[PDB]
Design a protein around this ligand. Structure first.
Ligand SMILES: [Mg+2]
Ligand SMILES: [Mg+2]
Ligand SMILES: [Mg+2]
Ligand SMILES: [Mg+2]
Ligand SMILES: [Mg+2]
Ligand SMILES: [Mg+2]
Ligand SMILES: [Mg+2]
Ligand SMILES: [Mg+2]
Ligand SMILES: [Mg+2]
Ligand SMILES: [Mg+2]
Ligand SMILES: [Mg+2]
Ligand SMILES: [Mg+2]
Ligand SMILES: [Mg+2]
Ligand SMILES: [Mg+2]
Ligand SMILES: [Mg+2]
Ligand SMILES: [Mg+2]
Ligand SMILES: [Mg+2]
Ligand SMILES: [Mg+2]
Ligand SMILES: [Mg+2]
Ligand SMILES: [Mg+2]
Lengths: 143, 145, 78, 58, 206, 67, 55, 141, 64
RNA sequence: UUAAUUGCGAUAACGAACGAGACCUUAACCUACUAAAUAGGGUUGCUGGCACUUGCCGGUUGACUCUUCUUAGAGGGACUAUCGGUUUCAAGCCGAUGGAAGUUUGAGGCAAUAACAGGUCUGUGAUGCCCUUAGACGUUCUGGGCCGCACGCGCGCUACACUGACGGAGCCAGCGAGUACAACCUUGGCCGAGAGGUCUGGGUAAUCUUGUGAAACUCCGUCGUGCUGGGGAUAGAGCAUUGUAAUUAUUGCUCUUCAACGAGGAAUUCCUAGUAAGCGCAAGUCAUCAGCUUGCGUUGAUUACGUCCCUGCCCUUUGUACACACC
C-alpha cells in the first residue's frame, strides 16, 4: 500500500535522497562549498568533500516534510552540536546560516519547498510527491 | 577495495619546502607537519589540488607534490579566499600572505623585534618573557618548564 | 615526555604483494576476523585493516555475524 | 515568582541560601453576554488582593 | 512459523515463535545452568528478558541485587569511569558485541560462558583488617556468595577495562577474551589471576 | 520509626473511653467516626488517630488491656 | 564645579547606574522584576512585599 | 461509533498517549510504525508487550501513540507502558474479564512497570553542593 | 588435594570485627546435617546461603 | 523501643510549657467532579500526496463534540492496611501480599534554653563614643590599581584518549525570563564563511522567542596506540559586537604555532537511589564578559542496609589537684 516518509528509516531515506539528488544535475551547489566548516561548532569541513551538500539538502527536505514549517534559524538550531571551546565548558553553537539559506533556496528552485504564509518554508505538493516516491524506492529497495 | 600499491614506488620520506616529512601518514596530516600549515589549511590545499583526500603522502606522484607546493605558496591565485589565510593585511606592505615553515618563524621574529624596538607595552612584555594577552600571573605560569 | 615504550613502526602502512598472498592465505583458518584480530598479526596498519576487512566481502570468503560500526564480527565461511 | 538570596549580610558563615516566592493565579473568563449587566458585574464584588481586568475584545 | 497478518508488518523473525524469549533474540536462557550449587539463587538466568536493559528498583531493599539479571549486572558494571559513567546504551551494545564474539569462539552458548566465568573468577576465601594498629595484619575469613558474584563481576570488568585501555582491541573483544579465559581456569585471565592470588594470600594469613 | 507520639495515643484513648459502643473493627468506618465525633484539624493526624484507635480496639477485642 | 565637568561622566549603565531604592547602595542589588532593592533589605521586607519562605 | 479508548504511560518526564481502536493491526508511534522507534537497541523493549501477549491477540486492533517529553529511553519506556495499558484497558472495556486478567498475568509477571508507572522522580537540588544530595568540598587548612 | 566443602547457614550470630563489616554465622554441612561449625563471613548473608570452605576443622573466633 | 526527653512502663513524684512530632511547600496517584480557541483529542468539513477498497501520513484559527494526557480548584488517598513471625506479649521491630505510595513515602521550610568577646560600623538616613569637617577622611572630574610576579596553599574547568577524537545523519526535556517612559526575548525574509549585519513581524506572556529541534546519546564512515586527527595552553595576523572609552589582549569569529600532560606520593574530599557521576539549559551577576552560584531536566550505576576501629555527637556511671574548664 501507499507509503510516506514516516514509514522508512531516517538514515537510509536521507542517504538515498542524497544519492538521487547527486545523480541528477539539478540542485546547484553554492560555489563556496569545499570551503566552509558548516558551523562554528565544527573544526573541520565535512569528511565527504563533495556530495555532503546533497546529504544536507536531503535531511532538510525530510525535516520540512515531517514538521510544520521550518525557517533558517530553526535549522541553525537543529544542526550544530557542541564546540570544543579550548579549555572552557562546551556549549551549544548554532549552525552556519548561509549554508542552510542556500539549501532552502536550492530546494525552492527544485520546487520541493514552498514559502509558507506563517513564515518559514513548508513542503510543496510536487516535492512531497517526489519524497514519497523515493521513500517507496528505498522501501522496495530493502526487500 | 584494496591494491598491491606497486611495490617499489611508494615513497617513505619526502622533502617538501625544505622540511623532512614522513609520507606514510595521510596526505593532509602529513602536510600538517610543516610549520604554518594546520589540518584545516592542509585539507583545503589538498582539496584544491584535486589529489585524493584518503590517499597516502608517500604514494602520490611528483607533479602532484609540485602542484600542491605551488598552490600553498600563492593561495589567492587558486581561489583560496582573502580570509582563511595565515597572515592577512600584512602590516609591512598590506598584501595578505601566508607564512610557511621558515618564513613563519622568521617573520614572527621580525614582528617580535619590531614590538621590542617600538617600545610598546606588549613589546617589552614579550622581551621580558611574561604573559602578554592580559592573564593573571600570581598563579599562572609559575614554572618555566 | 617519556621514552619507555620504545615502539617501532610495527604496522604495514601500505599493503605489499607478499602480504596480500598472506592475508588471502589466512583469510580462512582465522575462525574469527576483526580489525584488532587482523592487526594483531603485524601485517595491517589499522586503517587498511578496514580496507582488507571490507574487501573480503567479495566472493563470500567470510560471513558477517554483525556489521555494527566501530568494529566488525566475521566468521570463516563454511 | 522566585528569588534566591544569601542569608548572610556580610558573606561570613557557612554557605546558606533561601528562596522567597509568590504564586500568581490568573483564571481568565470570557462571556458571550449583554452589555450593561456584564459591566455592572465588573464594578461589583471586588476584594483587595485579587485584581480584576476587563477586555471588551469586540 | 504462522506469521500474523497486521496493518503494521513486524519482521518475521520477531514474529516466529515468540514464546521462546531470547536475550538478544539470539541466545536461549534455557540450556543455561549454574554448575556450582553455592552461587545458585544469586545468578538470575532463570527469568527471561528481551533486552539487557531494565529500569528496575534493584537497590531499594537489601538483597534484590540478586534478582537483577546477571547480564544486566555485567552491563551496569561495565559503565564504570568518570568519562563514561551514565552511558548504559553503550554498555548494552558492548555486552551484545561480546556475546556475539563469544558465540563465534567456541560456540558454547555465550550465556553459559558468562555464568561459568563468573563461577570461576569469584574468590571463595578472603581477608579482613583485624590488626590492632601496632600488630596490623590481614585475617582469613569466608565470603558471602552474593559478594562472590559481585567480586567476580568486578574483576572481570576491571580486567576488560585495563585490557582495552590505550590498546588496539575494542572493549567488547577484551571483555570476550576475559570471559572466555575465565570460563576455564586459564591463569592468563586477569580476574582469575587476582582470584588465585587473593585466595593464596588468605591461605597465608589463616 | 513510627511511634505515634502523645497526641494520637491520648486522643485514641479518650475516643475509646467515650465511644466504645460506636467504634468498630474497620479502619474506614472508624475514620469516618473520627471525622464526625472529633474535630481533628488536619487529615494526616486524623488517619493516624483512626489507625491507633483501630489497633487499640483490636487489642481490646483480643482481651482486656491496661490503661 | 563647572557644569561641563561636575557629574559629567555618563551613568547610563554599569554598577553605579542604578541604586538600592532603600539604601542608595550599589552592592548586592536585586534587579529581578524591577525590585531594585538590595539583598538584605529584600530579606527584611519580603513578607511585606509578598515573598515568603515556602520550600 | 468505533470502539476505542485512550490511555497513557509515563516516565520521569516522558508521556506517551495511546489511542486504541478496533483496526487492522496498525501500530504507529508519532505517525511512524513501531519498528522504527527513535533509538534501535531498546526496540525490543517496545515490542515487549507485543511478544509477551502475542500479536494475534490484537490483529484487528490499531494503535496510535504520541510520545512527548523526556529523553529517548524515557520516551521508549513511556510507549511501552502506554501500549500495555491501552491493551489492558481496551480488553476490560469491550472484550471480556478473563482476557484482561490473562493479559495482566502475562504482564505483571514480567517487569511490573509495564502496567504500573514508575515511582522514582528526580530529587530537588540544595545549596552547598553541585548535586541533589552532594556537597562541594572541605579545605580544613 | 581439593577438599572444597559446602555449608548452608542455619542462623546468623550478629556482625563482628573491628571494622564492623564482617559477620558470624552458624553453618551446617550439606552432608551429615547434624554436624555444624561457627564461621566468619565477609559479605552480606542471610538464612539460606551456601558458603564454600576450604577448611573444616576451623571454628570462628570473635575478631577484635 | 524510637530518627527523637519517641513511647511502653517503673516510680517522690503530680501535673504542665518550649523543642521533636504535629504543621506548610513540593513530588508522586486520581480514566471520580468542575471546566478550557492562552492546552490537548475525536468525528466531520475544505484540501496535499501515496495507495488504489473502503486506507495510510499530512495541511485548515471551517464546524460539532470530549477532557485520557496539559492545566488548577474543591476533594479522595496511607493510617504500617491485611496476614505471618518476634516482643515484660505492651511500646514496638522483621517479612510477604494488596497498593501509587510501606526509609517519618521521598526533598525540604520553620526549628528550643544557654552561649561565642565567632562575622558584619564595608547593607542601612540603624548607631554610642572617638577622629575629620575646607588645599576635607565630604562630593565630583581625569588617569592608574584592585589582574603585577623569584614563590606556597584552597574551590574548580579542560584533559591525558579506542567505553575515543573527527565528519555527516538521527532529534529528546524541565525549571525560567523577556520592552515605558524605554529601548527587552527574538521568529521569519535577505546578506556574510562566522561572529555578525539589515528589513520586517509577533510577545507586557500556557498566545510570540518556544515543542527553547540543548549536549551527553544513537546510526553510518575517516582515523589506528603514533604525545597521534588526543590535549588546546602560550602567541602572530585579520574580521566584528557592547561600550564615551576595550592598550594591560572586554567578548565572539577565521588561519597558524601547537606546549605541559603517559591515570598522578604523602595525604585528603563528597556520596547508599532517579543517589553519586557524566551531560547540558535557564535564572542571579549583565551595556559586553563566565570556567561561579542558585535551580532544572537528560543518560544513569558499583557497593552497603553495618560498626564504634579513626574523627566526633547524645545519655548514664566514675575519677579529677581542671572552671580563662586538657589548647
Ligand atoms: Mg548534529
Ligand atoms: Mg558525534
Ligand atoms: Mg573533549
Ligand atoms: Mg565531557
Ligand atoms: Mg549531579
Ligand atoms: Mg483528568
Ligand atoms: Mg502482628
Ligand atoms: Mg521530612
Ligand atoms: Mg561611620
Ligand atoms: Mg569618599
Ligand atoms: Mg581581588
Ligand atoms: Mg567554597
Ligand atoms: Mg582534537
Ligand atoms: Mg520543553
Ligand atoms: Mg541539538
Ligand atoms: Mg596534536
Ligand atoms: Mg562570584
Ligand atoms: Mg547508616
Ligand atoms: Mg581553680
Ligand atoms: Mg598537656
Amino acid at each position: 500500500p501507499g507509503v510516506s516518509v514516516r514509514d522508512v528509516p531516517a538514515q537510509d531515506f536521507i542517504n538515498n535522497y542524497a544519492s538521487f539528488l547527486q545523480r541528477q544535475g539539478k540542485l546547484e551547489v553554492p560555489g563556496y562549498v569545499d570551503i566552509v566548516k558548516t558551523s562554528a561548532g565544527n573544526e573541520l569541513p565535512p569528511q565527504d568533500s563533495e556530495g555532503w551538500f546533497y546529504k544536507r539538502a536531503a535531511s532538510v527536505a525530510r525535516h520540512i516534510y515531517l514538521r510544520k514549517q521550518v525557517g533558517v534559524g530553526k535549522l541553525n538550531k537543529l544542526y550544530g552540536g557542541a564546540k570544543n571551546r579550548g579549555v572552557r565548558p562546551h556549549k551549544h553553537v548554532d549552525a552556519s546560516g548561509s549554508i542552510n539559506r542556500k539549501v532552502l533556496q536550492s530546494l525552492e528552485k527544485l520546487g520541493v519547498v514552498e514559502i509558507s504564509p506563517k513564515g518559514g518554508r513548508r513542503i510543496s505538493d510536487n516535492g512531497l510527491r517526489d519524497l514519497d516516491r523515493i521513500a517507496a524506492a528505498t522501501l522496495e529497495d530493502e526487500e | 577495495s584494496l591494491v598491491v600499491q606497486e611495490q617499489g614506488s611508494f615513497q617513505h620520506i619526502l622533502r617538501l619546502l625544505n622540511t623532512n616529512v614522513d609520507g606514510n601518514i595521510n596526505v593532509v596530516y602529513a602536510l600538517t607537519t610543516i610549520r604554518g600549515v594546520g589540518r584545516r589549511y592542509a585539507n583545503l590545499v589538498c582539496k584544491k589540488a584535486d589529489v585524493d583526500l584518503h590517499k597516502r603522502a608517500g604514494e602520490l606522484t611528483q607533479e602532484e607534490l609540485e602542484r600542491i607546493v605551488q598552490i600553498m605558496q600563492n593561495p589567492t591565485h587558486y581561489k583560496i579566499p582573502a580570509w582563511f589565510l595565515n597572515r592577512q593585511k600584512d602590516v609591512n606592505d598590506g598584501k595578505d600572505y601566508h607564512s610557511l615553515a621558515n618564513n613563519l618563524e622568521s617573520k614572527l621574529r621580525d614582528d617580535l623585534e619590531r614590538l621590542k624596538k617600538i617600545r610598546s607595552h606588549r613589546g617589552i612584555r614579550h622581551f621580558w618573557g611574561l604573559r602578554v594577552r592580559g592573564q593573571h600571573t600570581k598563579t599562572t605560569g609559575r614554572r618555566r618548564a | 615526555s617519556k621514552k619507555s615504550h620504545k615502539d617501532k613502526a610495527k604496522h604495514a602502512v601500505v599493503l605489499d604483494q607478499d602480504k596480500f598472498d598472506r592475508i588471502m592465505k589466512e583469510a580462512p583458518t582465522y575462525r574469527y576476523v576483526s580489525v584488532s584480530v587482523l592487526v594483531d598479526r603485524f601485517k595491517l596498519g589499522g586503517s587498511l585493516a578496514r580496507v582488507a576487512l571490507r574487501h573480503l566481502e567479495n566472493e563470500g570468503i567470510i560471513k558477517p555475524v554483525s556489521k555494527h560500526s566501530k568494529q566488525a564480527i566475521y566468521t570463516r565461511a563454511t | 515568582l522566585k528569588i534566591s538570596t544569601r542569608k548572610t549580610p556580610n558573606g561570613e558563615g557557612s554557605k546558606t541560601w533561601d528562596t522567597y516566592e509568590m504564586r500568581i493565579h490568573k483564571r481568565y473568563i470570557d462571556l458571550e453576554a449583554p452589555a450593561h449587566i456584564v459591566k455592572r458585574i465588573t464594578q461589583i464584588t471586588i476584594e483587595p488582593g485579587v485584581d480584576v481586568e476587563v477586555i471588551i475584545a469586540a | 512459523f504462522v506469521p500474523v497478518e497486521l496493518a503494521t508488518t513486524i519482521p518475521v523473525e520477531i514474529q516466529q515463535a515468540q514464546q521462546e524469549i531470547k536475550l538478544f533474540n539470539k541466545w536461549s536462557f534455557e540450556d543455561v545452568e549454574v554448575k556450582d550449587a553455592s552461587l545458585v539463587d544469586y545468578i538470575q538466568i532463570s527469568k527471561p528478558i528481551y533486552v539487557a536493559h531494565t529500569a528496575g528498583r534493584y537497590a531499594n531493599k537489601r538483597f534484590r541485587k540478586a534478582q537483577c539479571p546477571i547480564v544486566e549486572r555485567l552491563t551496569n558494571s561495565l559503565m564504570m569511569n568518570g568519562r563514561n559513567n551514565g552511558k548504559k546504551l553503550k554498555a548494552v551494545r558492548i555486552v551484545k558485541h561480546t556475546l556475539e564474539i563469544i558465540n563465534v569462539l567456541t560456540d558454547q552458548n555465550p550465556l553459559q560462558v558468562v555464568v561459568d566465568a563468573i563461577i570461576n573468577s569469584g574468590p571463595r576465601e578472603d581477608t579482613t583488617r583485624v590488626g590492632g594498629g601496632g600488630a596490623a595484619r590481614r585475617q582469613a575469613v569466608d565470603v558471602s556468595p552474593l559478594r562472590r558474584v559481585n567480586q567476580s563481576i568486578a574483576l572481570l570488568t576491571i580486567g576488560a577495562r585495563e585490557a582495552a585501555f590505550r590498546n588496539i582491541k575494542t572493549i567488547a573483544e577484551t571483555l570476550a577474551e576475559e570471559l572466555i579465559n575465565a570460563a576455564k581456569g586459564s591463569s592468563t585471565s586477569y580476574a582469575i589471576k587476582k582470584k588465585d592470588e587473593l585466595e593464596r594470600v588468605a591461605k597465608s594469613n589463616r | 520509626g513510627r511511634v505515634r507520639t502523645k497526641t494520637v495515643k491520648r486522643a485514641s484513648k479518650a475516643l475509646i473511653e467515650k465511644y466504645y459502643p460506636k467504634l468498630t473493627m474497620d479502619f474506614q468506618t472508624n475514620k469516618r467516626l473520627c471525622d464526625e465525633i472529633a474535630t481533628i484539624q488536619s487529615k494526616r493526624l486524623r488517619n493516624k488517630i483512626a489507625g491507633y484507635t483501630t489497633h487499640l480496639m483490636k487489642r481490646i477485642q483480643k482481651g482486656p488491656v491496661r490503661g | 564645579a563647572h557644569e561641563n565637568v561636575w557629574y559629567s561622566h555618563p551613568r547610563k549603565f554599569g554598577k553605579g547606574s542604578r541604586q538600592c531604592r532603600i539604601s542608595g547602595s550599589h552592592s548586592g542589588l536585586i534587579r529581578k522584576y524591577g525590585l531594585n532593592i538590595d539583598r538584605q533589605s529584600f530579606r527584611e521586607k519580603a513578607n511585606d512585599i509578598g515573598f515568603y519562605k515556602y520550600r | 461509533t468505533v470502539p476505542s479508548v485512550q490511555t497513557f504511560g509515563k516516565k520521569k518526564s516522558a508521556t506517551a498517549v495511546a489511542h486504541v481502536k478496533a483496526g487492522k493491526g496498525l501500530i504507529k508511534v508519532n505517525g511512524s510504525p513501531i519498528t522504527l522507534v527513535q533509538p534501535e537497541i531498546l526496540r525490543f523493549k517496545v515490542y515487549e508487550p507485543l511478544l509477551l501477549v502475542g500479536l494475534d491477540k490484537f490483529a484487528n486492533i490499531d494503535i496510535r501513540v504520541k510520545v512527548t517529553g523526556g529523553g529517548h529511553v524515557s520516551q521508549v519506556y513511556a510507549i511501552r507502558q502506554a501500549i500495555a495499558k491501552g491493551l489492558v484497558a481496551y480488553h476490560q472495556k469491550f472484550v471480556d474479564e478473563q482476557s484482561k486478567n490473562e493479559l495482566k498475568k502475562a504482564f505483571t509477571s514480567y517487569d511490573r512497570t509495564l502496567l504500573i508507572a514508575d515511582s522514582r522522580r528526580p530529587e530537588p537540588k540544595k545549596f552547598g553542593g553541585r548535586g541533589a544530595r552532594s556537597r562541594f568540598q572541605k579545605s580544613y587548612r | 588435594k581439593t577438599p572444597v566443602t559446602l555449608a548452608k547457614v542455619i542462623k546468623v550470630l550478629g556482625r563482628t570485627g573491628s571494622r564492623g563489616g564482617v559477620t558470624q554465622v552458624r553453618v551446617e554441612f550439606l552432608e551429615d546435617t547434624t554436624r555444624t561449625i561457627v564461621r566468619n563471613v565477609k559479605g552480606p548473608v542471610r538464612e539460606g546461603d551456601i558458603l564454600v570452605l576450604m577448611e573444616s576443622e576451623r571454628e570462628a573466633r570473635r575478631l577484635r
